[PDB]
Amino acid sequence: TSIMAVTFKDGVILGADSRTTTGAYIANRVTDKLTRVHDKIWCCRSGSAADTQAIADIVQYHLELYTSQYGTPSTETAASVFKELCYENKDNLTAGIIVAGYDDKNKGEVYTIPLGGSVHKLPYAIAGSGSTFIYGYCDKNFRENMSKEETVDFIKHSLSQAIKWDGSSGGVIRMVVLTAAGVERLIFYPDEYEQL
Amino acid sequence: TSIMAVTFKDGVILGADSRTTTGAYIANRVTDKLTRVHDKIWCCRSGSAADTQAIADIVQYHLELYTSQYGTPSTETAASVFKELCYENKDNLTAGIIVAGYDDKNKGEVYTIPLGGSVHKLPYAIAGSGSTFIYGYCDKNFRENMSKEETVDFIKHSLSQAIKWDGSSGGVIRMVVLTAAGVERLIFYPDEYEQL
Amino acid sequence: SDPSSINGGIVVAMTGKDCVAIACDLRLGSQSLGVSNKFEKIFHYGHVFLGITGLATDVTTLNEMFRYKTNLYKLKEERAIEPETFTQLVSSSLYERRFGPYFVGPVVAGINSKSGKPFIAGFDLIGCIDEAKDFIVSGTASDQLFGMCESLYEPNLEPEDLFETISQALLNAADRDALSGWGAVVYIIKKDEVVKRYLKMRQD
Amino acid sequence: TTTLAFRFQGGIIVAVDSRATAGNWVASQTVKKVIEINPFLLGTMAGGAADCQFWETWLGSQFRLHELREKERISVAAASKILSNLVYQYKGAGLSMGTMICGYTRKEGPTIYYVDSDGTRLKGDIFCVGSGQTFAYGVLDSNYKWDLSVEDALYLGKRSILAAAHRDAYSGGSVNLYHVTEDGWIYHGNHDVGELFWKVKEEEGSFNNVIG
Amino acid sequence: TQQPIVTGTSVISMKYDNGVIIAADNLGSYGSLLRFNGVERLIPVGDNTVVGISGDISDMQHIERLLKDLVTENAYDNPLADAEEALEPSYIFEYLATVMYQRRSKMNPLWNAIIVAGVQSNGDQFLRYVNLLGVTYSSPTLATGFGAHMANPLLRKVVDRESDIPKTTVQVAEEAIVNAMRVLYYRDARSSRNFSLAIIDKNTGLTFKKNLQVENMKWDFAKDIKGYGTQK
Amino acid sequence: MDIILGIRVQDSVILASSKAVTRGISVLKDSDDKTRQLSPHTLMSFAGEAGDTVQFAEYIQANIQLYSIREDYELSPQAVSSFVRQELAKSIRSRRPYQVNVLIGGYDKKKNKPELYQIDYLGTKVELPYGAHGYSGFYTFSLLDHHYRPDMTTEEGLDLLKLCVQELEKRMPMDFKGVIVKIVDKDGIRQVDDF
Amino acid sequence: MDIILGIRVQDSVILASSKAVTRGISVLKDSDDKTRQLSPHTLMSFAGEAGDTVQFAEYIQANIQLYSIREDYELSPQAVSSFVRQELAKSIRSRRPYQVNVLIGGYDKKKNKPELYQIDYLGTKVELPYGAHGYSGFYTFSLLDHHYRPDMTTEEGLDLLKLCVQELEKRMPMDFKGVIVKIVDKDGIRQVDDF
Amino acid sequence: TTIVGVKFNNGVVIAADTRSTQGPIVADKNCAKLHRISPKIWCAGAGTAADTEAVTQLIGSNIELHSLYTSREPRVVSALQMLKQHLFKYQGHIGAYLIVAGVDPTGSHLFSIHAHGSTDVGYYLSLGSGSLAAMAVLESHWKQDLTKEEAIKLASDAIQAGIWNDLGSGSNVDVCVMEIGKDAEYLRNYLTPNVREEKQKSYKFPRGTTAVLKESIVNICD
Amino acid sequence: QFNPYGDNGGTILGIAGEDFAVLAGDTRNITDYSINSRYEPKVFDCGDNIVMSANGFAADGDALVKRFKNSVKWYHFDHNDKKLSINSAARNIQHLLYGKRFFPYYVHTIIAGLDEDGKGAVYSFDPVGSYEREQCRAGGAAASLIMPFLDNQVNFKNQYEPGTNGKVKKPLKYLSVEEVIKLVRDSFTSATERHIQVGDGLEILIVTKDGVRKEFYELKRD
């Protein structure tokens, strides 16, 4: 995997490649690594497919039950539930998750949860095997309060490079836009992003 | 280490950080990783300090003896001597060397020699532990036939990011400019490059 | 299977006023089994004395080797080897076997016949020279010997007093070590007389 | 350790050394390796030191509870079996105990039981236990007869420990002697090997391997 | 049984005449990768104690939550929660020390080295260390990780024993700490330039300083160093 | 291999060596002589690794016999033992060392004295009044410490030896099928046929 | 522990069991009886891991004795052997299994027939005319294949057994200090004192 | 060990502690870790004690023969080259960590060599177990254009940091000053801040306390 | 893999007189080659005229002392403020240690005080609870250095009466508090010289019928 989440003026955008590997074999070239845990709280999954899947399902269950009793949960709350699962089961899990959500009060927020199970609130976050190759690029090119079109380009160019160098990344670039307007799914094919 | 070599209009420039580590301890913070094997053929050293040092000394000896008999050697010739040592002793060496030199016929040339001992002629090359973090940046920002000032900025910005993310890199940024004019040594201190 | 603690044994050396002393235990065992109670670890070549602890086969081998070498030295030089020179010979010979060493802990002792100065020295298995004004210790009860010597010793002891100090240092150290003891020998060395005394110690 | 106990005409002799080791470091020379369980029962200790000390002390507490409940002193067989069943529960956990339960009762007469941390329990007339058991056996077996006198039996036991104290690097210090009769156990003193060896060497004319 | 993932490096500290000083950089390393740069590793408890933590950051965040919860629990049914029955540094330390040793005894340690700095209610300086093994010790100067090897030697030149504490001012003490932080930036490969520093004084109270930087660095001599031996 | 003993008395050296040769769960032979005559007044017993033992013993035997022919003279027991020790001392630092322990019993005709040398596979030599290799020593040394006297006769030495064999037969785990006993004195080497 | 044998003849079952108890390089005892009477007409011999052997034997003994008292009736050898097998079959998949091999010799009073059962520590049961555990079988089975006949008497069975012990004493590496022999027949269990 | 090297105005100074260890035991309380390669080229050694002494003598011997062959005073870079090629050939198995310094016709020099054969250049260096304690002092107090007296102070202070704070270092401070145009001065035990206090008691035994079995005169003459 | 044990160094020493007893210990605390503290006491007054030290792994040492101090407290509650005798304390400590037989306290424990006849008493333990009363015991890192010296000077081992042909032993006698402290100070200075984990300071706790007194002395800090 190569995954990222980036806050901007109107909210937050999540981004991911679509490659799933079993060794050097690509088990799925059209994977959906961006997953819904609530209406406007999503996450990017990296590491063990099975582990991240089981975690995401438990979180989705917790937040659905939270909503039934206390109404819409904050993005911080969602990240805390992810953390709790990742931290307490650190010995048995291989999960690097980025949590991203849109409140109306707090606007766009991004929390990253590495292997250990620590929580880190950031303006933007990158993760997965392919992220190593774009630390330099992302740091030089990220700006706060970007527009939607600028953030889409930032993610597209970033993941394009991550895909180009990482063999464990590839396929299509999926994106999910989180704003007050709603939820928008975007896809970008090789023939476009490869020749950037 | 973070090291690189970049060809440009007038010739070629080598670049390197100055950090030498023994574990997490910095044994030398002002190291000179750019080494002369001939008047206008230099190399960047990454990997084992002892191995790369012993190799560079043998190459310098070979090229001095070559010059006594057959005159100035080509950059390709120098790279071939490095390769021969790295390939034939691959089991006992940990050396990632970039060879860069200036001919008047061939102008600037860069050859990279990874762990295996293979040779790769490239427009520019990056290597060492810190290079992983700047593949994305360097690919997006490199252009052929750059000027001296553009190439210096490209290397300075690149190594600055490599240093920022890699703990095994740091200190000053040393550079060596190879052109028809001659040989020029450049140095850049933290107070400058850190805030780029 | 640790070569330095299969057979067991100890050696200690001390300086006094115009004199030196070197002492050793008599045990040779095979781990827990005590085999011999006559195995002396101190040898001499002319007026230079050499004690050796450690693997017993190497003790014997090195004695035979230094006898060999000091004999050829005397024939060619036409004089007895001195303690300072012999110390260097021991160091060279041990370091020659750097990557296949003799598992020993040698100790040189003697008085320089020209200057009259007392001299002692110790080595590690690989040849590193350890020179000392006061004392040298070696063997399986080296820790014990260090503690005894460091407390009991004082400078400029007379030969008769020095004998008591070195003897008590060895005896009490040996009694706290399972692989050392079973008898002891003490050499008192003056400029031109040498007295050798066997000590009465507990036989367990 | 070297410990022994043997049955004979005049009851039971029990003899032990007093050395404690931590590798080649001599930890003690004055350790008590016989525990007096009651006026008619003795226990010898060999192997791990806390293991022996703790469980044989615990053992005495169980036997005190037996005579309170049953109004009768516990048998040597039942005593040794409480210990063997105890260590068997711990089998594999790494206890190290080589023990001899020696005593007298009316129904049994003089009795010795060997019990070890493997769970082995054996009734017998002669046993030697510990790192120096073989050295003790050598002297004891070659001089043993059923018709030994109390005076000769006491000496043979003493001499057998001395033999092992000398040769075994992990035995020594001093010899503790006991004699068990129909009237109970009787202590026959602590004998330092420092003086005992030379006394025996001179008087007996033995130990000719040593420089006199 | 753990392995630490995201880690924090040295925490350094010392006593002075009226109180204590403690400092730690703002880095969260991911092996050789210098991953996170906005990490606060000094955590105040009340207005009289600062806990400095190195090692695993996920475990550091857990300890933050425990201290946060300790303040809440202490306030329950306690009219003197901001007076005589406030949390002391010695109480906070003993709690953590108990936890650290319990966790090591269950073979599931909190992979941290902790220094609790503060001032007691009677004015006495408090400075004590505890780590993943549950080992505890106190000294005029204390430091974790590389700090133990490089900072302590420098801080001990100022305060070498107990009698040197009354003779050491806050100006002298802070200067030594800031100097030590510079040396660590020169020589520790998992350190950062940015750091936080905290002073707990018996008179002026808790002063928490954020976003400090190492400065007045000597790099100029590097230009003269050419090659590794025979290069001119 | 396993049990080899040696006892030096007033006028002779007595060597006792077990007869069993075992491999696996089978005793292949019960009449094996674990000794070689090096010279008319020198006998060497041996025990250790299969193959190595005989190969080493015969190699020494050949060398001593060669010396005897060359000089028309018998080497002293001390001289033979020193030669044997050096060969083992070389061996231990070889590619494949001889894993052989030996006892050398001899009668020095110049000194008119019996001599017993114990040498292990490392090249560790000691002169002793009585000696043993392997597990035997754990019983016999203490036994001899008690019963041995320096001025004993050959007959007293054989009774002392019987006492050792009896103890070993009682307390040793393995059946070693008795021993072959040989005496070395001023008249040379002879075997006791009824033991 | 080590050597336990069993032979079923016309009218009886004969069990032979070694007397040695060894630990390390010392034979601690040479008169050990490696058997327990489970019932008047059923005898069980045992060999294996130290401690486990006796603990298991006495545990079975207690259970069979309990059954006898409850029902005022003696279980058949077949029934006892099946009970023993099941206990071992449970044991092998426990946290710490009993490492004990057993032979069960019994006389079925209802059938008027002797019966010998061989059961290993895994719970592997077989009824046999002759049986052995451990290394003994590698010698005794082939010997009995040759010399055994089904219609032999108890005296013929004892001579056949003497032939086994002699072979074992000749070819086995360890000294097992002879055997205790016991006979099981219509009249119950008795020990042969001179073997 | 703790060893250092410091460059100054007209030369270079090196220093070292005097402790030798075998495990947790102090084998030598006053050993000499400053080694003469040539009259004006000296070497400070850390690591395996015998290796540092043997490798410094071998190269020192070959340097002398080279000096006689070439009719020239030896250079530091020659010692550096010979030491590093020797150490590299043995792939680290010769555990010598050296600070090489000296003056020669080319000028004054300061280098360090590691066991595997890598060399460094610097104005201030430190090697050994107490190198971190020493480097902390060097990084704090070093400056460009040091005088002779300032460099000796800085070097000894760096060694003291090792002596007090590192358990692998102790006892005394040895120094060697190599100035251009002058003889090198070897200052053995330049500082001795670890003198043993008076003992509370004299353990001189009454004569006859030890029990003796035999006596004999030993012949040492021919 | 996580290793739950560590070594904090240091060494301790207990001597018993006629009407008094001392328990001494150095104040240095270490890990590997670093000094953690120059003054970290590990000899404690536990009440009822019992002093205690558990030297080795400090975390286990502190845990044990803490549990024993607590054991003394509950002994008073459960048995009408009865004084815990030194022999009873020793047995209690055995059970504390043996309770963790299969996951031991990595410490060598020593306690000192007065027995019920008013005479000086020292008890010493192995890590898993085996104990023994003695006149003399050293524990910890430098135990191997100090103990044989104590055998010689306290119990007069290997010392015979002059002129008696090694036949009459030096008679055993109690030492004065002045003489005992002399031996303690010399024992630690000697241990400090040759053991790297021992030094900084010496703290002695003296126990008489009047109570528990303290004395402190400087040791070498290298």
Ligand SMILES: *[C@@](C)(CO)[C@](*)(O)[C@H](Cc1ccccc1)NC(=O)[C@H](Cc1ccc(OC)cc1)NC(=O)[C@H](C)NC(=O)CN1CCOCC1
């Ligand atoms: C990139 C490919 C590599 O990190 C991504 O992290 C990707 C994330 C992803 C994939 C699918 C759906 C959502 C998110 N991860 C994988 O493709 C993952 C690679 C991986 C395997 C094991 C790991 O450690 C436990 C870490 C990363 N692929 C898988 O999990 C596949 C489906 N299964 C296997 O490879 C079989 N594994 C199972 C776990 O044990 C090892 C063998």
Ligand SMILES: *[C@@](C)(CO)[C@](*)(O)[C@H](Cc1ccccc1)NC(=O)[C@H](Cc1ccc(OC)cc1)NC(=O)[C@H](C)NC(=O)CN1CCOCC1
């Ligand atoms: C960065 C720091 C990491 O790769 C550079 O590659 C740097 C390159 C360099 C350094 C000095 C001079 C010229 C070029 N390399 C190092 O600093 C190097 C790190 C390294 C060690 C071992 C390796 O595998 C054999 C690979 C890289 N540092 C060293 O060689 C230092 C001087 N020595 C040690 O760390 C001791 N090593 C010796 C080899 O065996 C392991 C222990």
Ligand SMILES: *[C@@](C)(CO)[C@](*)(O)[C@H](Cc1ccccc1)NC(=O)[C@H](Cc1ccc(OC)cc1)NC(=O)[C@H](C)NC(=O)CN1CCOCC1
């Ligand atoms: C002789 C000396 C051979 O050791 C005896 O067996 C002797 C018997 C004995 C009995 C009671 C009191 C003292 C001494 N045994 C020892 O001295 C014993 C030897 C031994 C050590 C470790 C073992 O591992 C299980 C088994 C035997 N020594 C000790 O017990 C020493 C004093 N203590 C330790 O070694 C502490 N260890 C014990 C095991 O657990 C870890 C800590």
Ligand SMILES: *[C@@](C)(CO)[C@](*)(O)[C@H](Cc1ccccc1)NC(=O)[C@H](Cc1ccc(OC)cc1)NC(=O)[C@H](C)NC(=O)CN1CCOCC1
């Ligand atoms: C400090 C004390 C290290 O603790 C120094 O490096 C010191 C340097 C030195 C130089 C010249 C003269 C004396 C001392 N080194 C030592 O004192 C050294 C420590 C050491 C031990 C073992 C090592 O490898 C495992 C490396 C360093 N001590 C010794 O060399 C002692 C005298 N010898 C031994 O311990 C035996 N060696 C032989 C070589 O193989 C390892 C064990």
Ligand SMILES: [Mg+2]
């Ligand atoms: Mg190499």
Ligand SMILES: [Mg+2]
């Ligand atoms: Mg960096």
Ligand SMILES: [Mg+2]
């Ligand atoms: Mg001894």
Ligand SMILES: [Mg+2]
């Ligand atoms: Mg002994």
Ligand SMILES: [Mg+2]
């Ligand atoms: Mg010290």
